[PDB]
Nucleic acid binder design. Sequence first.
RNA 1: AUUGACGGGGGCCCGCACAAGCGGUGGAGCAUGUGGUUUAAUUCGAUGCAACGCGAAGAACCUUACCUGGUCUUGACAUCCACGGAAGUUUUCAGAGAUGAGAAUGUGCCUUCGGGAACCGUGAGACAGGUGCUGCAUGGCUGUCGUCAGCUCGUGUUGUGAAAUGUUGGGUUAAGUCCCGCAACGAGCGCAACCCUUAUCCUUUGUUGCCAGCGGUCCGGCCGGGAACUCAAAGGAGACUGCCAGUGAUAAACUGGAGGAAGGUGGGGAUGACGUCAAGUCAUCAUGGCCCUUACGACCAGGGCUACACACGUGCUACAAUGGCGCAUACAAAGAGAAGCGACCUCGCGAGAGCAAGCGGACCUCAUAAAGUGCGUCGUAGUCCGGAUUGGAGUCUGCAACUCGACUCCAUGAAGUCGGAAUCGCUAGUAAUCGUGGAUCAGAAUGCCACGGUGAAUACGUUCCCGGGCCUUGUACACACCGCC
Lengths: 50, 146, 125, 206, 66, 96, 84, 100, 115
Amino acid sequence: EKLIAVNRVSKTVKGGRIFSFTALTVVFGYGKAREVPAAIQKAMEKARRN
Amino acid sequence: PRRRVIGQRKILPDPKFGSELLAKFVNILMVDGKKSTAESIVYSALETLAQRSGKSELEAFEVALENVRPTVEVKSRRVGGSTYQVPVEVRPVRRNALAMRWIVEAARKRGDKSMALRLANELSDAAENKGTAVKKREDVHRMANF
Amino acid sequence: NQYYGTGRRKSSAARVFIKPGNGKIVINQRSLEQYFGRETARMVVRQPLELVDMVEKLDLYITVKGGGISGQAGAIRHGITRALMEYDESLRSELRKAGFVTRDARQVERKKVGLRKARRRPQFS
Amino acid sequence: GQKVHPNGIRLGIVKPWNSTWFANTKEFADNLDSDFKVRQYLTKELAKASVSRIVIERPAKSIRVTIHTARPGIVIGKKGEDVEKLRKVVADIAGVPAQINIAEVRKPELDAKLVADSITSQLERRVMFRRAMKRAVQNAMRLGAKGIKVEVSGRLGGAEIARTEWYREGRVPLHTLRADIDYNTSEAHTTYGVIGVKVWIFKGEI
Amino acid sequence: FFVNHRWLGGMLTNWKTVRQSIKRLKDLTRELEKLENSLGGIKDMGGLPDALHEHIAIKEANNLGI
Amino acid sequence: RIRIRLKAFDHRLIDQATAEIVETAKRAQVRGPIPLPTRKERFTVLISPHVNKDARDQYEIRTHLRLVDIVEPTEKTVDALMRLDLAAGVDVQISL
Amino acid sequence: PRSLKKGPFIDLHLLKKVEKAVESGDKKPLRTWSRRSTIFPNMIGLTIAVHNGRQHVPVFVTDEMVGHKLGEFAPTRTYRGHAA
Amino acid sequence: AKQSMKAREVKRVALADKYFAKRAELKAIISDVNASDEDRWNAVLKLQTLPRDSSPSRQRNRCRQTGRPHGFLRKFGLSRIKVREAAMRGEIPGLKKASW
Amino acid sequence: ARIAGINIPDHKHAVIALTSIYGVGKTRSKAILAAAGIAEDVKISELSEGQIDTLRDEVAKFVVEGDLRREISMSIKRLMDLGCYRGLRHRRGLPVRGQRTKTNARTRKGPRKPI
RNA sequence: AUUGACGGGGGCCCGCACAAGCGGUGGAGCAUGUGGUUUAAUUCGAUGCAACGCGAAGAACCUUACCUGGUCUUGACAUCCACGGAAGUUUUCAGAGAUGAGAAUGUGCCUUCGGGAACCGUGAGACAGGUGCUGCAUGGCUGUCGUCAGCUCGUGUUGUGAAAUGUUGGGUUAAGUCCCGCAACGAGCGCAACCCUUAUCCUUUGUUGCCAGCGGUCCGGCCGGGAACUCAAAGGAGACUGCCAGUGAUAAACUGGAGGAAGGUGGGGAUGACGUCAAGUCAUCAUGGCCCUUACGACCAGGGCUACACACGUGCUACAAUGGCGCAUACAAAGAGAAGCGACCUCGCGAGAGCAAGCGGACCUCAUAAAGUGCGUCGUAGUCCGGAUUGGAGUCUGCAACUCGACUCCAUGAAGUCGGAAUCGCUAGUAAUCGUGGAUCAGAAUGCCACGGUGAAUACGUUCCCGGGCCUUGUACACACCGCC
Ligand SMILES: CN(C)[C@@H]1C(O)=C(C(N)=O)C(=O)[C@@]2(O)C(O)=C3C(=O)c4c(O)cccc4[C@@](C)(O)[C@H]3C[C@@H]12
Ligand SMILES: [K+]
Ligand SMILES: [K+]
Ligand SMILES: [K+]
Ligand SMILES: [K+]
Ligand SMILES: [K+]
Ligand SMILES: [K+]
Ligand SMILES: [K+]
Ligand SMILES: [K+]
Ligand SMILES: [K+]
Ligand SMILES: [K+]
Ligand SMILES: [K+]
Ligand SMILES: [K+]
Ligand SMILES: [Mg+2]
Ligand SMILES: [Mg+2]
Ligand SMILES: [Mg+2]
Ligand SMILES: [Mg+2]
Ligand SMILES: [Mg+2]
Ligand SMILES: [Mg+2]
Ligand SMILES: [Mg+2]
Ligand SMILES: [Mg+2]
Ligand SMILES: [Mg+2]
Ligand SMILES: [Mg+2]
Ligand SMILES: [Mg+2]
Ligand SMILES: [Mg+2]
Ligand SMILES: [Mg+2]
Ligand SMILES: [Mg+2]
Ligand SMILES: [Mg+2]
Ligand SMILES: [Mg+2]
Ligand SMILES: [Mg+2]
Ligand SMILES: [Mg+2]
Ligand SMILES: [Mg+2]
Ligand SMILES: [Mg+2]
Ligand SMILES: [Mg+2]
Ligand SMILES: [Mg+2]
Ligand SMILES: [Mg+2]
Ligand SMILES: [Mg+2]
Ligand SMILES: [Mg+2]
Ligand SMILES: [Mg+2]
Ligand SMILES: [Mg+2]
Ligand SMILES: [Mg+2]
Ligand SMILES: [Mg+2]
Ligand SMILES: [Mg+2]
Ligand SMILES: [Mg+2]
């Protein structure tokens, strides 16, 4: 299994900025989550089906 | 208010005569919850307004109210930035309310010694179109210009 | 027999005993006129008997404690209304319509932290 | 916003008091101070013995202390050796005849104080804060908590800027008064200062 | 087996979640009718079925190969 | 005649304690338990360490109070009532 | 003021100094911190240097001062006007 | 509170207890309607000479946990802050949040 | 009419009229009239010249008017000459009885003096 | 192009936000906090809303952190070590006291007569000590938007992607409240409910509370009694849009009606989502780092925190006749009390004093409710309004009321005749007004927290002002319009 990059993305809210993480994995899969570990899992899950 | 669901509270009739009109009048005269004080003023004033009229206390009260009750008054409305003074019809409850308020306000700044006498004199003057209460009604009518 | 009713208003509670008679009213071992100075108080007490037309058909023995002059007058009215309904249950509809059967549950609202009173807030600059 | 103490708001609804004695004003303050010194002593002495809660009762001219413990064997000791030491010190502190009773905490992973103490112990051993928090949550939900929240606040990982992090699983309905919310706290004294831990464990209504 | 009212977007692509409403209907009057007017003809299906306006249902069927 | 006043911070606790007494003594005619007025002692505290004067907590201790009177009491009664054991957190007070 | 039933207050240390000063003859100033002590008749003619927080202010005792406290004659605050 | 400030209070409580009977004896003479003016005067001068810290009015109630000299509650012997902390942990018997 | 070298009001009740005298308040006024044997609610106009003589004798038992002003002047002068704290407060025209001066003190200081 | 935020863009809504009202503040005197100035010191902190009767629920000494001066150096507060002392207790002198120096009396307890420790020195030196600094290193606790109705996640699906959907829409609600539709299906935290209190009833128990009917009286529930009633406090019952009609989408719900003590969240409280402001607090406490150590630590007396050309905030008392004064006389609730509450009686004009019951309280005490009502008087005056200020004389607490207490008596009798621009609170047992209690506390409230009494006016409405919610739209904003330029 092959993670390629991890990007930190941001959306702005009333309070400030919600930072979140993206994970690109071929085994392709593009995951999104609040944490890096969760993002990679979602990516790897998607890369199996796709 | 915005939700505008305001009903009205059960006014008890005045104990002596049995008028809700006069009960409201006592409430408008009353200060600091001292209803017993206000009742004695109103009834003292009415007794004098009877012996200086030759009629029932409430008949003479009615005559005074007749001459003070407004029919029309102005209301401010924001249209264009510069705020107009717009005449509208006064509904009959507000007519009685303003008249009583004006009579009480008139009587309070009169120069007689007791409030009972000040009030009797205001109602006497009102019942023949003279004092400051009827001047307020006339002033309101002058302003009432859309 | 005696017909009984408890009445309450603000912090007053009244005990009202009614028997066939001719318009005696005793409140705390005193006449109505002696006990209550105010006409409003006396009117309030007599309102139920005036409504049902039994002012000089009934003797009232009353005791009352707590609250003030208006509280106690209101408590007595409620008590008389209940005693009447024990005497004659047909009177309920008329007494209900007059608003005498309701226990007025308005009480003093508590003082609250940061307020001068129950609702009066300190002045803001 | 600030939140009401979950234990405090449920006292008498679904949570018992940890001190159950009667006193008039005369003895009230003195009893609170003796209770304070008893709990201070026992918390010091039984730091390694997984103490969740110390219930104090004062029947007559006496003190009865119940220690809720996940490791009862070492509190009690060797045919009641360690417990007899504690009793004699508790009687000295309290100034009345003492009785120490021992209640076992089965399922220490569902005990908010022990979970909080477990996390703060790990943080003082320089364990990564996220891993301590996640394991606590996972353990509680495995043994049948209807929910758990864990919060850690301070200089996490020795960061200069302090921050709060929290994780929840399941239900933690704090506004529901009949909810059995077990709540407790702990402090990790690290080389970069204090890290506070808060644990909420929900175990069902009533 | 049949879906004869509204096809719920994710009926089969999100089968795992719609199964929890199957379990919910099975255990259990208005929450009933709302489920028996929807998931009442997939309650014994047990998994991804054999074969089947319904652009959504066809699209889900193509994703899985049903 | 033995007046027994019970006090407790918990009404469930005191009602159990009185039930233990009256049971023991009714095996002597007792009177009660009489529920005397609960004392509500109240405390208002500032909850901030500094300033914020309008932020307070209000706390209460309720002291529940019962009276039981034991009449024509026997040697068994004075004994049975002392070999009795009430729960902790219930203050008991006898008067002869 | 102090109840008449209790008599006038004087610090014992000051009383003993004054009594010794009076019997010895005309003294240097008596140094005291007892601002709260009442001035008695036997103090008339003595200088009592009374503390004001930072220095002992000389107070030559007269008959009119009798019954006052010593601190009345040694002001503790310094004020000479704003905007000087 | 500083350790010294807590130590000052311990000294005050000790001295007050040591001299309680003596102080009451002297104040009884000074309050006595029928005492000699010599006896009252001697008693006034004697009461001065005892340590000032033997007067109970010199004691400031302090929180028994922190030594805080403000916000004290006599019932609990604690400051407002420590009362709250103990109250919420269920350590003050009977005490709960009040509403009415 | 004339008591203590001042004109007392003739229309007023005796108890109120005597309080025109400096040194006579309500308590002393009532005591004067009790001693003189005159009712409080009698007007000064209604009293006989013998009754005004009795009031003059009763008023002569107190320090009033010019004698009292002299006593009060001398008491303040004593303090100011003593150089006591109260004396210094009198000289400076500030409150003498421990009142705050950061604010208020307007009775002693008078109207505000703009900076 | 996306998510926000913002718009003197649009649509729809809400809140004493405005309007309608009632009473205030702003003027006066005083109380109190703050700024400033002053000072030896006027200890430190809180600063737009969200600091300014705030931390402080109570600074004469103490408290006390500050100043002046006098003093101590392993030490006021711990542990360890060694040696010599039982510890205590009575007292004298010098000293402002800290403290220094003497006198005198104790000599126990455990005790394998090996002893040790309860407790005192004194001598080391590891240490103690710090209300010293950093709240922008932190924990904990708190304010705030706001009790506003929001804030999210999993999985699915959509988009290259930031992200979106769900959460929007049609209705409806106090409410993302509920219904219906819908590429979403579900879920979590919030809403609501569960908790406390108040309004009605029932059961149980019946003294210290109760007195309807008896019997008796000293006419006082006072006494025998009674267990009815008030009440006490445990347990129950009761309200659900449940019933009826109309309306509505065959919905949710809405409008009205019945019954009912109560009606649509019945009234009030507790309860404060994700987050925001490097918001507040290193002086409650705790704590990283830094810093001081014969001093930034410690002890003492006296002073200061109470200063006063002045400015601001929060209050109290007024300016009177709906009132003042005098006499007479009704009706509360809630609470506190043993180094405490203190009756009766006697003394005092009074604050109080003396004597001395009762009460750890439904029993005794605080403890007079006041406004009210009746009668009388004053007669519109700077007054019989107001009660500041000052003189004199006292009382009490307290080692001690000079700086700097509260209260009393006699005397004094200021400003003030309803307050400019502006501005605040309140929608009902509310506002307004009237007393009552409590915490802190030796003493020291006009503050704070709580309790009853009397008891209003007004709301057409949502155009406008302030804060906020939802949808949509433009943006060169993202330190987010207090922006960018
Ligand atoms: C004085 N005033 C109350 C200021 C203010 O208005 C603030 C605000 N958010 O409105 C602050 O943050 C303000 O209150 C505040 O907290 C400030 C700070 O915390 C700091 C700190 O800690 C260190 C350096 C600088 C600052 C600061 C400039 O941001 C401070 C400004 C403060
Ligand atoms: K005069
Ligand atoms: K001053
Ligand atoms: K903080
Ligand atoms: K999603
Ligand atoms: K620090
Ligand atoms: K004030
Ligand atoms: K003001
Ligand atoms: K006057
Ligand atoms: K003083
Ligand atoms: K004003
Ligand atoms: K006090
Ligand atoms: K917009
Ligand atoms: Mg009130
Ligand atoms: Mg305030
Ligand atoms: Mg004096
Ligand atoms: Mg410390
Ligand atoms: Mg003190
Ligand atoms: Mg003062
Ligand atoms: Mg308005
Ligand atoms: Mg003003
Ligand atoms: Mg600081
Ligand atoms: Mg300051
Ligand atoms: Mg700061
Ligand atoms: Mg700011
Ligand atoms: Mg001081
Ligand atoms: Mg000496
Ligand atoms: Mg901060
Ligand atoms: Mg949203
Ligand atoms: Mg919801
Ligand atoms: Mg939807
Ligand atoms: Mg209805
Ligand atoms: Mg809720
Ligand atoms: Mg800051
Ligand atoms: Mg000092
Ligand atoms: Mg100050
Ligand atoms: Mg007057
Ligand atoms: Mg008290
Ligand atoms: Mg009590
Ligand atoms: Mg006077
Ligand atoms: Mg003038
Ligand atoms: Mg409202
Ligand atoms: Mg008041
Ligand atoms: Mg909404």
